[PDB]
Structure formats: structure tokens, C-alpha cells
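Archive entry. Fields below.
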Amino acid sequence: RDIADTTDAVRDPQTLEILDITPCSFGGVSVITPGTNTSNQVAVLYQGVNCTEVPVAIHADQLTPTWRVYSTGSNVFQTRAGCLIGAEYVNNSYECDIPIGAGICASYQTSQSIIAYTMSLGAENSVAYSNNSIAIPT
Amino acid sequence: VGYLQPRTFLLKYNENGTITDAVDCALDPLSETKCTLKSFTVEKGIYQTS
Amino acid sequence: NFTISVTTEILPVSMTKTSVDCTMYICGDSTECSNLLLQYGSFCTQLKRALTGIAVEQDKNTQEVFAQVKQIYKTPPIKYFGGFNFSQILPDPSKPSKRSPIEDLLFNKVTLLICAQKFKGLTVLPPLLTDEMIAQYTSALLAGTITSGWTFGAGPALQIPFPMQMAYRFNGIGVTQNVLYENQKLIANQFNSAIGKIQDSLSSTPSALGKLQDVVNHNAQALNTLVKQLSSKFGAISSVLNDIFSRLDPPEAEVQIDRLITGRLQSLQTYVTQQLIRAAEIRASANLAATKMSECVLGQSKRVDFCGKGYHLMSFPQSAPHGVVFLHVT
Amino acid sequence: YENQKLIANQFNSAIGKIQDSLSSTPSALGKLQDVVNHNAQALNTLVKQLSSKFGAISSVLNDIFSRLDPPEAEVQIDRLITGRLQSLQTYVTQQLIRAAEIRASANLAATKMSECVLGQSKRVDFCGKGYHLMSFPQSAPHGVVFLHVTYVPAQEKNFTTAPAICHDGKAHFPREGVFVSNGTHWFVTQRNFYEPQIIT
Ligand SMILES: *[C@@H]1O[C@H](CO)[C@@H](O[C@@H]2O[C@H](CO)[C@@H](O[C@@H]3O[C@H](CO)[C@@H](O)[C@H](O)[C@@H]3O)[C@H](O)[C@H]2NC(C)=O)[C@H](O)[C@H]1NC(C)=O
Ligand SMILES: *[C@@H]1O[C@H](CO)[C@@H](O[C@@H]2O[C@H](CO)[C@@H](O)[C@H](O)[C@H]2NC(C)=O)[C@H](O)[C@H]1NC(C)=O
Ligand SMILES: *[C@@H]1O[C@H](CO)[C@@H](O[C@@H]2O[C@H](CO)[C@@H](O)[C@H](O)[C@H]2NC(C)=O)[C@H](O)[C@H]1NC(C)=O
Ligand SMILES: *[C@@H]1O[C@H](CO)[C@@H](O[C@@H]2O[C@H](CO)[C@@H](O)[C@H](O)[C@H]2NC(C)=O)[C@H](O)[C@H]1NC(C)=O
Ligand SMILES: *[C@@H]1O[C@H](CO)[C@@H](O[C@@H]2O[C@H](CO)[C@@H](O)[C@H](O)[C@H]2NC(C)=O)[C@H](O)[C@H]1NC(C)=O
Ligand SMILES: *[C@@H]1O[C@H](CO)[C@@H](O)[C@H](O)[C@H]1NC(C)=O
Ligand SMILES: *[C@@H]1O[C@H](CO)[C@@H](O)[C@H](O)[C@H]1NC(C)=O
Ligand SMILES: *[C@@H]1O[C@H](CO)[C@@H](O)[C@H](O)[C@H]1NC(C)=O
Ligand SMILES: *[C@@H]1O[C@H](CO)[C@@H](O)[C@H](O)[C@H]1NC(C)=O
Ligand SMILES: *[C@@H]1O[C@H](CO)[C@@H](O)[C@H](O)[C@H]1NC(C)=O
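PREDICTED_STRUCTURE:
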């Protein structure tokens, strides 16, 4: 048992090898959509799961979601909040539009598709500091 | 010929009570997002579903 | 004569986000309950909505405290600011995490399998701003208040020499600027000595970070007593749901588990209601920390005993686990 | 005064852009929109919570006396008289939570009217970005709206400065200003605006 007093380790009655019990994978499903006034394609985030555990169940009558063709969708991308299915990772950074988590913010860019990227905090600037130079507005 | 099974739908009524539109709640994630938001128009953002 | 004293001040900003789903906490892996659980209506949509709102606003608290500048400034390579030593607060590029020597202590003295042993329908969402961009915002605040002073908080950043920015900070106190220049070797030596004691006193008193220690203690322990009530009997025969159906008849069980479906629901309602109390305390403290950052850091405050005990000169923010730490120079 | 024709023309263009700014983005009044939406959507679930059986045989109590007897009705109505009882306590408790959030915001707006409107605030970023000049309140449905007239410096020019000058063997510090040089000569000027003056 553990702190929460849950059965998480058992010994098999045949042989003396020990077994570990971890529960079945569960998590919420979050959609990443633009407006329906805009295009109707969405991206789906499975919260807090390893992403090798979702594409085993591309079958019929096997999960709480019923769709099957979307699991064979666009490129998956393991973030720190599960993997995002239906949106592609893009290297350069922009401002946040639809927040996802751990810096990932998806948006609708250019044909057009839902892309995911790391947040850009702002424009990088270097103040011209000197020990004898001042700047005064005119 | 088609087969009926227990399914949950969202039906849009007009001012005269006719079924002008409907959306399934289990077809694709956009439809169940519309079904759990109780609206045929979904604004831009993130939404938690089943 | 005078002395220059640096006094730290620790404020919570956000708490850990969380999300509870409807059926898996109450009667998970039980298809005979989910049809019976529909007999309550808005029992759990309300709970989900409240917890999602507590979470959305946990990202607004961090956004409105740190992200106050639209431009990420950076420090110049020349690290001679008038003889004042700022090595403890500017980031250390040699470390893989771009954090100051002082932020490295603060991220080691706060402790959170603990978050992962609550997996009974409980999901801890990650924050939107990750840890290495909150400290990037703090470095942007420090790179502006040294090179530009208060001018970055009210318009374009207008560069100025630091020994001269401190003359205008002295003019707001009530002393003229001639006392700073005739004593700058003494003032620069006294400031670095005072900022060296912050690195020692933070790792001396254990409960210095008790303001951030109990915001993670209260959330984890209330999470602990939330899953501790799944073993609660609530006057039934067995706390496990499946043994009630097999070892008891169909008519009696539905009413027999009806007090196990509202006793366990009132345990979830108590957790949600307690979170709205705790979120309001943090939101009242995040708006206080935003007031500290917008006034003590982005300017010189004339408010007595607001940005430190004494005559406030200029303050520095430091990132912290689920909070912010201010370094008030008085 | 030497720039009042420019300043008054600059102010009128700014206050005309406010009406176009509010009427454009929809999220402009969202602060007030989610106030009335949270009240309406909490009344809707409270109305819909009496449509649920709460573990009883029906959602209406008049039917459960016609098709069921008196001695065990008490236990049947008790399961429904406590479901709507806990639903009303849940609605009241969320109303006290929202009232504390509103009163903390009405105390801020009373502070904004007392300080930004009835005076000039030296608290930076309290009454808008930039140096505060004055504020104008406007009414709104279940709220108040301010118009913070501020002062944003622009068109900065680089300069070379000195802490002090020494002329007769003794240091000279500026009284209210800063010593600057345009490359050749030394001038004293205001900190927040450039007007060069002869060192006197
Ligand atoms: C820095 O500022 C000073 C002060 O304005 C500048 O000195 C001024 O320079 C202008 C022309 O460069 C002079 O105007 C003309 O000077 C001639 C000299 O014979 C005179 O005959 C004309 O009638 C006219 O006045 C001006 O006199 C001079 N100011 C003084 C007090 O002598 C200086 O050039 C600036 N340096 C820069 C911009 O690099
Ligand atoms: C009964 O238990 C014994 C041990 O407690 C099991 O015996 C082992 O079986 C495995 C494979 O079946 C062998 O590799 C080991 O060498 C056996 N150990 C011993 C000590 O005999 C046995 O399999 C169990 N089941 C039955 C049906 O006898
Ligand atoms: C104000 O106090 C400081 C702190 O004691 C004084 O600095 C010391 O001065 C003595 C002699 O003047 C030196 O021996 C010490 O080494 C100084 N301290 C340090 C840390 O360097 C300062 O002199 C005082 N000012 C006046 C005007 O007396
Ligand atoms: C700023 O303070 C730091 C911290 O004391 C100084 O780093 C020390 O420098 C001395 C001499 O170079 C070394 O003996 C110490 O080991 C250093 N300490 C650490 C933690 O690295 C730094 O030199 C100071 N910089 C200035 C410009 O005064
Ligand atoms: C005054 O102007 C700018 C700052 O406003 C100084 O720096 C120049 O501008 C940017 C700032 O980093 C750099 O990319 C340029 O390369 C800088 N120019 C030079 C020549 O270094 C500028 O140096 C200042 N000029 C004077 C005459 O004081
Ligand atoms: C829908 O999108 C069009 C542009 O594609 C825009 O002009 C219009 O205002 C939008 N309407 C709503 C209600 O968002
Ligand atoms: C997810 O699975 C991959 C491959 O099985 C593994 O390398 C990785 O460590 C896993 N991540 C977690 C958080 O368990
Ligand atoms: C994008 O980034 C990854 C890793 O950050 C890198 O391997 C890849 O080459 C990059 N692609 C481009 C086109 O720069
Ligand atoms: C500015 O600092 C550098 C390096 O410390 C020094 O060489 C230079 O003389 C300083 N400038 C002035 C005006 O003191
Ligand atoms: C609904 O009924 C009114 C009343 O005659 C009619 O004017 C309107 O066109 C009808 N709307 C429909 C059929 O969509």
C-alpha cells in the first residue's frame, strides 16, 4: 500500500516474483478550436497521458470517445500536458492565442492549419547603457 | 434501410417549433464540443469535454 | 549618518491548478452507477466549472504580476554599475536554468510521487507560464530598473547611469543629491554588504518561506483528505461499490448506495467550496503583489512602510515557487 | 502653454479613438459581461435542479402522493426535500463568494475615483500607463469605466551627461534638473523634457 492506502503492489500466489499495480490510463480531453465562424478543423489535447497509450485503441467500441479516423490524424506532439493530436509543432515563436500549458500556445496560421508553438514573451531589446550617457525625450 | 441505436443529440428549434438543425454529440470532437457548450457556434479557445 | 538596509518580502501569487471529473471519483469503473448518477442534474458540471475558473484565474495572477512590460530587456555585458554589485540578482548563464544565485536558493527551499499518488480522478494541470519564462520576466524587470530606472514603466526605456539614478532616488527621500556622490564609495560598499546577508538569512531561518510553504501544504493536504474519504463507509456495508451490488439485492442497493453517492458528493462539494475560499485569498494577494511590482519596482513609492521599513529607494523582484520575493532597498 | 494648441489637439484625437476602441473588440466590456453571465447561469442551474429526482421516484411531489402511500412518502419526500435544500445552500454560498469578489472590486473602484479622479496620483501604473494627469469616470451597466489621461514621453534623444561640474575649484550640482552635453557645450535641462538652459 501507500500514503492513500490503495492496493498498488501484490505478490502472485504462484512463484515469489513481485508485481506493481498502477491504474489504467485516464485523463480529460480538451479541444483546441478556432471559431466556427472561422474554419471548422480542430485539434485535440489528451491531458496528462503518455502518447504511446492512445494509438493502440484505434478500433471500434473501445473508448469513451467514439471517433476512429481522428486518432490517425495529424502529427502528434508530446507536450508537458499530454500530447496534442491534430496540430503541428512550429519552431519560431509568436504571442499566445489559445493557451495549452507549459509554454505551448496554439493558433491558426497559414493551406491554413492549426499550429502549436512556444510563447514569445516580447520583443527583445538591449538598452544602450553607459556610465556617461543619458536619454531625454524631446 | 438504417439502424437506430441510443444516441444523444442536440436539436435546434426555430420560433415555430420545427427542427431546423441538429448536431450529434459523438460524431467528431467539434460536434461534442458544440453539444457540451449548448451552442451551434463555438468561440475561439480551449474547451474541456468528456 | 545613515545605513542602507535590504529587507526581503515574500508574497504568494498563484496556487496549484487542479481538475476533478464527475463519475470517476464518485463511482468509477461502475456502469450501474452512471445511469443512476444522472438523477442529480447539475451536480458535477457546477463542480467542473468552478474548478476550471479557479484554474483560468491562476494564470491571470501570474500574468498580471510578472508580465507588466511588453519588451524583454537584457543586461549589458559591462557589469560595472557604479561600483554596486548586482551578481546575486542578475541571472547566472553558467547554470542550465537561467536563475540568479538568490532564486536558486528559493527554488531549493520549497518542496511540493506526492502529486501522482492522488490519481483517483484527480488531475493537476501545469501552469501556462513555465518556470523558465517566469524567471525570464523577472530578468526583464531587473534589466530595466538598473539601466533605465523608472522610465521603462511609463513610456520608452530611457537609459541613465546608475550612480545618477540613485541621486534621483535620494531626491525623493528628502536629502539632496550631493550626499550620494560625496559618499558613493561608502554607499556602494554598504549596499553589497546588505545584499550579501539576504543570501545567508534566507537559508538560515527555516520558516522565511513559510508564506509559500503553506500555500502548497494546504492544497496537497486538502487533496489528501479528498481521496481519504473514498475509504469512508458513510454508514454503508462496504466502502467499495462493487461488493455492495454482488452481496446485496438490486432493490436495496440502489437506495443503499444512494447515501454513498451523496455522502461522497458532499465530500467533493466541500473541496470545491474550500478552493473558492483559498483562491480568493491568493487573488487578494496576487493583486497586492502586482501593486508592489507596479509601484516599488517600476518607481519610487512615497507610501510609508509599504515597500519596506524605512525610506524606500528602489526594489528588485525575484521569482519564487508559486510566488514572488521582493528585495526592498531602504 | 507654449504647446497648448498641440496638446489640446492631441487630447481630442485620443478621446475620439476611445469610442472606436470600445465598439470594436467584443472583449472590451467582458469585465461586466461575465458579471451578469455568472449570475444568470447560476440561476439557470438552480431552476433546473428541481427538475431532478434526487434519488426519488419522480421530480414532482404531487405525483408521489397519488401513486405512493403516506407512511413511506415521508421518506420519499425527505430524499427530495433535502436535494433542493442542498441546492439552495450551494447557490447562496456561491453568491457570498461572488459578493466578496465584487466588493473587493468596488473598493478598488472607490479608490480609483477618490485618487485618479479627485486628484493627481503619484502611484505609478495605478491610474494607467505613463505619468498620470487626470481621469474621467463614465457610468456603465453594473460597473464604472475610467478614461485615464496620461503623459507618455516620445522621441527620445541620446545625450552625454555628467554628475557635477567644477568651475571655481568647487563642485556644482543641479538644483532641479540634469547636466547634459550636446557634444560641445554643457546645458541643464528637465529630467522628463528637453529644454537646454545656460548653466547659471
Ligand atoms: C551644441 O549647442 C550649442 C548651443 O546652441 C551650439 O552652438 C551654436 O552653434 C550654432 C551653429 O552651429 C551657432 O549659430 C551661429 O554661430 C555663428 C558663429 O559666428 C554666428 O555668426 C551666427 O549668427 C549663428 O549664431 C551658435 O552661435 C552657437 N551657439 C553659441 C552660444 O555660440 C553647438 O553647435 C551645438 N553642437 C552640436 C549640435 O554638435
Ligand atoms: C505451485 O507453487 C510452486 C512454488 O511455490 C510452483 O513451482 C515452481 O514452478 C515454476 C514453473 O511452474 C518452476 O520454474 C519452479 O522451479 C517451481 N518451483 C518449485 C520450488 O517447485 C508451481 O508452479 C505452482 N503451481 C503448481 C500447479 O504446482
Ligand atoms: C557612517 O557609518 C559608517 C559605518 O560604520 C562609517 O564607516 C566606517 O568609518 C570608519 C571611520 O570613519 C572606518 O574605520 C570603517 O572602516 C567604516 N566602515 C566601513 C564598512 O568601511 C562612516 O564613517 C560613518 N560616517 C561618518 C560621517 O562618520
Ligand atoms: C559580487 O559579489 C560576488 C559574491 O561575493 C563576488 O564573487 C566573489 O569574488 C571573490 C573575489 O573575486 C571570490 O573570492 C569569491 O569566491 C566570489 N564568490 C562567488 C560566490 O563567486 C564578485 O566578485 C562581486 N563582484 C564585484 C564586481 O564586486
Ligand atoms: C545614442 O543612441 C543609441 C541609443 O539610443 C546608442 O546606441 C546605438 O543604437 C543601438 C542600441 O544598442 C545599437 O544597435 C547601435 O549600434 C548603437 N550605435 C553605435 C554607434 O554604437 C548610440 O551609440 C548613441 N550615440 C551617441 C552619439 O551617443
Ligand atoms: C465572422 O467572420 C467574418 C470574417 O470572416 C467577420 O467579418 C465577422 O465579423 C465575424 N462574425 C462574428 C460574429 O464573429
Ligand atoms: C512516455 O513513454 C515513453 C516511451 O514509452 C517513455 O520514454 C517516457 O519516459 C514516458 N513518459 C512518462 C512521463 O512516463
Ligand atoms: C526545429 O527545431 C528542432 C529542435 O528544436 C530542430 O531539430 C529542427 O532542425 C528545427 N527545424 C528547422 C527548420 O529549423
Ligand atoms: C565607465 O566605466 C569604464 C569601465 O569601468 C571606465 O573605463 C570609464 O572611464 C567609465 N566612464 C566614466 C565617465 O567614468
Ligand atoms: C414561422 O411562422 C411565421 C408566422 O406565419 C412565419 O412568418 C415565418 O416565416 C415562419 N418561419 C419559418 C417557417 O421558418
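CURATOR_NOTE: DSSP finds five helices and eight strands in chain D.
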